[PDB]
Amino acid sequence: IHEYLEFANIKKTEAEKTLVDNSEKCAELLAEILAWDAGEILKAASLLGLNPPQATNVFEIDWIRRLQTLSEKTMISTEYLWQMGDLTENSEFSLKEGVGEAVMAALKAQGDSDNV
Amino acid sequence: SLALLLGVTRLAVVPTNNMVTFFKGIANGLSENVCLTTDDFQRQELEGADWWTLLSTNQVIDDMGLVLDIHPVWGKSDEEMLMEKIQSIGVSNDNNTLSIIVQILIQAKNAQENLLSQTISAEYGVERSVVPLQLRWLGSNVYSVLNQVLNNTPTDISSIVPKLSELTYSLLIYTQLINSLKLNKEFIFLRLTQPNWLGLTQPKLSTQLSLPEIYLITCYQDWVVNANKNEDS
Amino acid sequence: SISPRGLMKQRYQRVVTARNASKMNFKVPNYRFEPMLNRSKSGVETLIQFGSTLLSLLERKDSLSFDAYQMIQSGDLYRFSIDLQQQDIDINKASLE
Amino acid sequence: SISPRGLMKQRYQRVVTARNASKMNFKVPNYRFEPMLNRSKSGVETLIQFGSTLLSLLERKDSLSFDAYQMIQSGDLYRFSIDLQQQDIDINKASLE
Amino acid sequence: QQQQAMALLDYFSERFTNESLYTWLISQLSSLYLQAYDAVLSLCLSAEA
Amino acid sequence: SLLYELNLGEQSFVGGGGWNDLYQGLMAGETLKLALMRMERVYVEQNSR
């Protein structure tokens, strides 16, 4: 955890931010310490100023704890959990009509059996 | 795990400056009173090295001739091969002046090996009897690692040679090859000595590994336990 | 009867940093060499005696602190044992009814 | 009820090669015999002290590593104990039905 | 019982004189013995001479 | 005193910094025995009329 956080903090303005921190391998170790998916964690690039983002040294890990447990309550993606936020504010209707159907299909994929 | 061990879709790692603290630790351990004879160690005409200048009343010829280094072989390696190699290279003075400079050299060879076998055992969790065999079977040499001190590896720039930075990465995968299954050094010693004699094909003198070995060495590692008599028969 | 459970995969190692650092010396003498060899020994070997005294006492300290903490492990088990078993008096009364 | 089974016939010995090898000496002296008997002793007996220190510490090392590995032997047994016994709640519910 | 057996393994593995201290002593002392052994033998050899 | 009384060039046996602050000075005395052994052997050789 220390070697990961020390690497995340290296020289954002003078070097690493415009080089995307080498996102393809720095964001990999954040998945590896969790034994988790190095893929969908890259959705974090939807916030924090075009950084990876990773140098916010706790809150992203603290949230990913809850994303990992939610990802074991249900087989839904973090990509769809973002839409469940976007729909809050009297938002566009076709996204709600689609998200309801997508969650229904994600339940059929488990059914009265167990499956995945 | 098997795909990683077979080298398909390989791992990623960060060159943290802690690695320099480790290699500077090796350089420090080499420098603090070990006083090692590694000063241009192998290559022919070994001239200008301190140790035999002091002992010159007993023997002068510090330059010797051909090289002072060893490759392992089964049944019996040891200082008898190091003696026979230096005895073969045209010394006509077969008296005690030749044998005394072998018993002066044995502890000086130990002082090159004992550094790695005692230190890296505390980094990676392997017994000191496995370390030099693991190092060669990975595709390395004890002096080639120690020469990286002379290549300025102890300098705390955030860059080091691939010969260390990818070797260190490769050591972890070969550590899982000796912990996801456990086996004894005599197997490694045979495998490293004589691949075709063990039963492999000539290309497997290289560092590369594939499933036709992994089946046979695993089914051997079962059969050596399953057999009705102890280890050595 | 539908599910297994995970385990304590408690296999992980820990690392000891086997390396050193050190510094140089100077000074000028005031009397002979062998008279100092006849004084330096006993002060050094007394430090080996003090260091092995400290080490061997610290094993005696940290051994007995384990023997202490191992006793209190029974305290919850007595509570759970009584508060499970006491119901067999109430069952033996319910059987009489 | 038709068959027995084999056993661990774990009787086999192991062999220790009790033999040696050794080499000759030369050199020429620079000062007297008894002054060297008055120096050679303490360096040798310090090596007996270092060797017995190494040996007695290595017993303390390899003893405590056994006490460690002996604890994790409980981890599977708790898993199997819970995943066998938990069914008696489901049987006590099936008996109420 | 399972969780306090895990807490005993934690309390044991967080003991001061755990496996690391004997390992650290021996892995240094192994050098002190060899640095003495390669040096002492000239005293008894010069006693013969 | 050795290097003055024999009038000799540098050999630096007594290196400073042998204390330890993870392990509170353990083994910081046994090194002094080996320093005296490395030192004594200069006197075993380098004395003559």
Curated annotation (Swiss-Prot), chain B:
It comes from the Bacteria. Transmembrane segments: none annotated. Disruption phenotype: Cells with a disrupted yenA1-yenA2-chi2-yenB-yenC1-yenC2 locus are no longer pathogenic in C.zealandica larvae. It is found in: Secreted. Semipurified toxin complex consists of at least YenA1, YenA2, YenB, YenC1, YenC2, Chi1 and Chi2. The Yen-TC:K9 subcomplex is about 26 nm tall and 22 nm in diameter with 5-fold symmetry and 5 copies of YenA1, YenA2, Chi1 and Chi2; the chitinase subunits may be solvent accessible on the exterior the complex. The Yen-TC:K9 subcomplex has no insecticidal activity. The native complex with additional YenB, YenC1 and YenC2 subunits is 16 nm taller and is insecticidal; the toxicity-conferring subunits are present at about 1 copy each. Part of an orally active toxin complex (TC) with strong insecticidal effects on larvae of the Coleoptera Costelytra zealandica, Acrossidius tasmania and Adoryphorus couloni and some Lepidoptera larvae. The TC has an endochitinase activity. This is Toxin subunit YenA1. The gene is yenA1. The chain holds residues 816 to 1048 of 1164 of the full protein.
Swiss-Prot record, chain F:
It is found in: Secreted. The isolated toxin complex includes 3 peptides starting between residues 768 and 778 of this protein, which might be physiologically relevant. Disruption phenotype: Cells with a disrupted yenA1-yenA2-chi2-yenB-yenC1-yenC2 locus are no longer pathogenic in C.zealandica larvae. Signal peptide: none annotated. It comes from the Bacteria. Semipurified toxin complex consists of at least YenA1-YenA2-YenB-YenC1-YenC2-Chi1-Chi2. The Yen-TC:K9 subcomplex is about 26 nm tall and 22 nm in diameter with 5-fold symmetry and 5 copies of YenA1, YenA2, Chi1 and Chi2; the chitinase subunits may be solvent accessible on the exterior the complex. The Yen-TC:K9 subcomplex has no insecticidal activity. The native complex with additional YenB, YenC1 and YenC2 subunits is 16 nm taller and is insecticidal; the toxicity-conferring subunits are present at about 1 copy each. Part of an orally active toxin complex (TC) with strong insecticidal effects on larvae of the Coleoptera Costelytra zealandica, Acrossidius tasmania and Adoryphorus couloni and some Lepidoptera larvae. The TC has an endochitinase activity. This is Toxin subunit YenA2. The lineage of its organism: Bacteria, Pseudomonadati, Pseudomonadota, Gammaproteobacteria, Enterobacterales. The gene is yenA2. The chain holds residues 1122 to 1170 of 1364 of the full protein.
